[PDB]
Amino acid sequence: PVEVMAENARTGSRQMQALTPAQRASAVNTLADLLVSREKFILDANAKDLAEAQKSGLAKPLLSRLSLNPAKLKNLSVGLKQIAEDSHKNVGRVLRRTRLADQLELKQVTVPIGVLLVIFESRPDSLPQVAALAMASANGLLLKGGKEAAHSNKALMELVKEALATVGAEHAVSLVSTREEISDLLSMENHIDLIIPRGSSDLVRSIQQQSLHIPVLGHAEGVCHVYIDRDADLEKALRIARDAKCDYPAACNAMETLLIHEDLMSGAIFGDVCNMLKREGVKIYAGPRLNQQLTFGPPAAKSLKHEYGALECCIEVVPSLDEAINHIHTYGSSHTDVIVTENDAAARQFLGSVDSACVFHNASSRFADGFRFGLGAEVGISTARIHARGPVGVEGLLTTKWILEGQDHAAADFAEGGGRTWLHETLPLD
Amino acid sequence: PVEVMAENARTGSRQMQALTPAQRASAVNTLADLLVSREKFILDANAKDLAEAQKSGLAKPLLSRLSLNPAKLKNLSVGLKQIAEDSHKNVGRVLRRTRLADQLELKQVTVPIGVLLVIFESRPDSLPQVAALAMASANGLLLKGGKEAAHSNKALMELVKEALATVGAEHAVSLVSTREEISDLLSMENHIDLIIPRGSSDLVRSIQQQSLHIPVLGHAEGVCHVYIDRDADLEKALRIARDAKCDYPAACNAMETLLIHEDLMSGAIFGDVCNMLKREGVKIYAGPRLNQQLTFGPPAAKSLKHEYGALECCIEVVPSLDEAINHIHTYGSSHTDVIVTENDAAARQFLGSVDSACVFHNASSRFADGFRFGLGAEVGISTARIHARGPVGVEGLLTTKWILEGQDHAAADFAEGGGRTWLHETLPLD
Numbered sequence: 001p002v003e004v005m006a007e008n009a010r011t012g013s014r015q016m017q018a019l020t021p022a023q024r025a026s027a028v029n030t031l032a033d034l035l036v037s038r039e040k041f042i043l044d045a046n047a048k049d050l051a052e053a054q055k056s057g058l059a060k061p062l063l064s065r066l067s068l069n070p071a072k073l074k075n076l077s078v079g080l081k082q083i084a085e086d087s088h089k090n091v092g093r094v095l096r097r098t099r100l101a102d103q104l105e106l107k108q109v110t111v112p113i114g115v116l117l118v119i120f121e122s123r124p125d126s127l128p129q130v131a132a133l134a135m136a137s138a139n140g141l142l143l144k145g146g147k148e149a150a151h152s153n154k155a156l157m158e159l160v161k162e163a164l165a166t167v168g169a170e171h172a173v174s175l176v177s178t179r180e181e182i183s184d185l186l187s188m189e190n191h192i193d194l195i196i197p198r199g200s201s202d203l204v205r206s207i208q209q210q211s212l213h214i215p216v217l218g219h220a221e222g223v224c225h226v227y228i229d230r231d232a233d234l235e236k237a238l239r240i241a242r243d244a245k246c247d248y249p250a251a252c253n254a255m256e257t258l259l260i261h262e263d264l265m266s267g268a269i270f271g272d273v274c275n276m277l278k279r280e281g282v283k284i285y286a287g288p289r290l291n292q293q294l295t296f297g298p299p300a301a302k303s304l305k306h307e308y309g310a311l312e313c314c315i316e317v318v319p320s321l322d323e324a325i326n327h328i329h330t331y332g333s334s335h336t337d338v339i340v341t342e343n344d345a346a347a348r349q350f351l352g353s354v355d356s357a358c359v360f361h362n363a364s365s366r367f368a369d370g371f372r373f374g375l376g377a378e379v380g381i382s383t384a385r386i387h388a389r390g391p392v393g394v395e396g397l398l399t400t401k402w403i404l405e406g407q408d409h410a411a412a413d414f415a416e417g418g419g420r421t422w423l424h425e426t427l428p429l430d
Numbered sequence: 431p432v433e434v435m436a437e438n439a440r441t442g443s444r445q446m447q448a449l450t451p452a453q454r455a456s457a458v459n460t461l462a463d464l465l466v467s468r469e470k471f472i473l474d475a476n477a478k479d480l481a482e483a484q485k486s487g488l489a490k491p492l493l494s495r496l497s498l499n500p501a502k503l504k505n506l507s508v509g510l511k512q513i514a515e516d517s518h519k520n521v522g523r524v525l526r527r528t529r530l531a532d533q534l535e536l537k538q539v540t541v542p543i544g545v546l547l548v549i550f551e552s553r554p555d556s557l558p559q560v561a562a563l564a565m566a567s568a569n570g571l572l573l574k575g576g577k578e579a580a581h582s583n584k585a586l587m588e589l590v591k592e593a594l595a596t597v598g599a600e601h602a603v604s605l606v607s608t609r610e611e612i613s614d615l616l617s618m619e620n621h622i623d624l625i626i627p628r629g630s631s632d633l634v635r636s637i638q639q640q641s642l643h644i645p646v647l648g649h650a651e652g653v654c655h656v657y658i659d660r661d662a663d664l665e666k667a668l669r670i671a672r673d674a675k676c677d678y679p680a681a682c683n684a685m686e687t688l689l690i691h692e693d694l695m696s697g698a699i700f701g702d703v704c705n706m707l708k709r710e711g712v713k714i715y716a717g718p719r720l721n722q723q724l725t726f727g728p729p730a731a732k733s734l735k736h737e738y739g740a741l742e743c744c745i746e747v748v749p750s751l752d753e754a755i756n757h758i759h760t761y762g763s764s765h766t767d768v769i770v771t772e773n774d775a776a777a778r779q780f781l782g783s784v785d786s787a788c789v790f791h792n793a794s795s796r797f798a799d800g801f802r803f804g805l806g807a808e809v810g811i812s813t814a815r816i817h818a819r820g821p822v823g824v825e826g827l828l829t830t831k832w833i834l835e836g837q838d839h840a841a842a843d844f845a846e847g848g849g850r851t852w853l854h855e856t857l858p859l860d
């Protein structure tokens with residue numbers, strides 16, 4: 001069934017709630033061990049299921065992401081080991097230690113979010129990742145993929161279920177797929193808490209539109225942007241654009257535009273970068289100001305708010321750093337940004353100005369992946385205006401809960417009628 | 431108009447964004463000064479407008495909350511002074527200082543939320559509160575009340591507008607009311623960010639239903655709950671129920687139920703508490719188990735998930751502490767809770783168990799107001815599953831923004847093809 005799953009999930013969440021000390025670390029340890037001890041099973045499952053899917057040939061991005069080999073298995077094992085190691089005290093943590101009057105102290109402890117419902121096109125290299133995520137943040141977890149690789153996902157589900165049942169006393173994790181009517185449970189409320197799409201632009205778009213009245217994660221479209229300044233040496237910009245566009249054209253956080261100080265048009269930079277893009281075979285559009293400054297020009301642009309995911313990168317140019325700010329905040333989804341120059345003043349004003357999901361200074365918008373931030377294995381990428389930004393580390397799955405241990409106190413007793421006063425002494429947090 | 435207001439708001443937000451050092455503190459200082467220097471104006475405005483509204487006589491809760499006197503003005507002045515004092519460094523704060531490789535350091539700075547849209551029935555003792563809130567968290571602000579007290583609210587708007595224009599160089603705060611079609615702008619997106627209802631149960635309910643796809647605040651219905659244990663001396667429970675129900679029956683966070691160890695039914699506690707409730711004239715319903723244990727009994731109960739706001743408090747009893755947990759998590763909106771006993775073991779298990787918006791140990795659910803937490807003047811009360819819980823302090827209006835200042839780095843350069851490595855040295859945060 002469906003709802004009984006969610007309730008089993010909540011129950012088990014509270015079950016494993018009181019089991020932090022070396023428990024869940026040991027749990028994901030044994031999970032890694034099981035991952036490295038039942039490989040032939042899961043390897044052959046993935047192989048046969050993907051092979052059976054090949055006869056259909058539904059789409060090359062999927063039919064590529066579906067891959068899985070012992071290398072990826074070693075990678076997942078080591079990543080989950082890292083999560084185990086650094087996941088010591090992400091629950092049951094204090095954040096403030098404050099007193100009000102005699103024997104009147106409070107704090108602000110951490111606590112799970114509840115019953116998450118992750119949705120992704122079958123990239124079965126993800127399932128154990130998020131499973132360890134849940135079992136480290138102790139918040140029980142549902143899962144829901146697509147018909148593709150369903151058998152392999154089922155095998156991984158057996159994996160994680162056994163691994164949890166080792167110690168944990170409850171299967172506080174479940175899979176529900178095979179025609180489960182995304183709109184049906186998506187419409188349901190008061191059981192699921194955080195919808196974490198991961199698959200690709202299709203899922204996140206279809207959700208953000210479809211979804212209504214539910215806390216979600218995941219951005220809309222990774223419309224990056226870049227800037228270069230009159231005080232930037234060129235070869236920087238060159239290799240930067242290389243890392244930016246040349247590397248992984250289908251990446252969510254992959255750059256999709258560019259912007260340059262108009263004055264340095266007279267620096268041959270344009271020719272260098274565009275000849276380089278052609279050396280790497282990159283389709284080129286541009287914008288109105290570029291249509292102005294030159295005669296022949298690359299083709300027109302459909303809409304500045306587009307996305308390509310392949311070797312295509314629009315290009316505009318403006319005179320004002322502030323005009324740059326206007327443009328970034330007007331068109332792009334403000335998922336990312338970057339500045340390249342040597343002056344700090346313009347740089348620091350910029351960094352202090354834009355409200356993207358991050359900024360950089362002589363870096364590569366390919367940097368935003370969490371793993372590159374030493375942030376522990378991320379769970380997604382958020383661009384929403386609340387509760388999480390950019391790389392959503394494991395901390396992006398926790399909330400607060402105030403506790404108070406008084407003796408005999410009350411509200412009216414603190415008024416002038418009683419001998420109760422406020423102190424607000426911020427104790428050293430334990 | 432409407433949208434131009436929102437855009438003026440965003441512009442001014444970024445305007446005052448780069449003006450932290452003693453600027454906004456001075457701004458709210460001068461705001462308090464103006465509040466204490468143009469009283470006759472605003473006092474007479476409130477007086478005349480409320481008097482004109484009295485002829486209608488729309489509702490006593492409103493026609494009571496509408497009050498305003500020099501005492502309340504002194505109170506607002508001192509509260510905003512407190513906000514000024516403690517609002518030094520809530521923006522431009524670092525949270526982590528981490529390096530990856532040579533000259534590759536990052537951080538995680540704070541940043542406003544954007545363009546908030548607060549909605550409340552006209553309690554004009556609120557407007558300057560939230561205005562100082564915005565101007566301390568630098569996030570520009572809209573405002574939208576009801577037709578009542580519109581003139582007084584307009585006067586306060588003149589107040590705050592002049593106070594901001596003193597220094598701030600932009601009116602990054604605006605009012606839009608007088609028939610502004612809540613559903614119209616509520617439906618609008620991509621300009622407003624956080625909807626903060628404050629008025630009363632009516633507004634929050636009508637919104638939560640009406641609202642769709644927008645980050646909101648404010649709970650649904652402050653269905654509290656209480657527990658008492660077989661290891662609690664009675665007079666505690668007595669004065670606790672006093673402070674709980676007797677004080678402010680219409681309070682959002684006011685208790686609405688009760689629960690007692692069934693064994694101590696044999697302790698005359700029931701008679702004491704109910705005779706006390708009658709001494710304070712409290713309407714009484716109860717629940718099925720109580721219907722069982724006694725014969726005559728108070729009347730039936732419509733639905734356990736109800737709310738009264740007046741001298742009415744349902745009462746149930748269960749044997750199992752865990753059954754208590756089940757009940758709290760099943761019926762109540764889990765806005766609050768409290769335990770009263772002397773054993774820590776049961777107490778500590780409880781506190782570690784329930785997932786309300788807070789818990790207590792020998793306190794009064796009237797405690798949850800933020801001001802009682804030394805938390806600075808709150809802005810609302812959230813019960814949502816994300817981003818804020820219980821007392822939403824001023825910190826509940828801030829987000830994150832990652833910055834990076836590298837030299838010439840890239841993503842592929844960190845692979846084995848380059849001499850780039852990861853360090854993850856958590857520097858001492860500045």
Ligand SMILES: N[C@H](CCC(=O)OP(=O)(O)O)C(=O)O
Pocket residue numbers: 251252253369371
């Ligand atoms: N393949 C990813 C890097 C590519 C990336 O941008 O992140 P992803 O969108 O695949 O989660 C990794 O292993 O860190």
Ligand SMILES: N[C@H](CCC(=O)OP(=O)(O)O)C(=O)O
Pocket residue numbers: 681682683799801
């Ligand atoms: N009147 C409030 C206390 C009552 C209360 O529960 O808070 P409120 O719902 O009025 O914001 C105060 O001044 O702190």
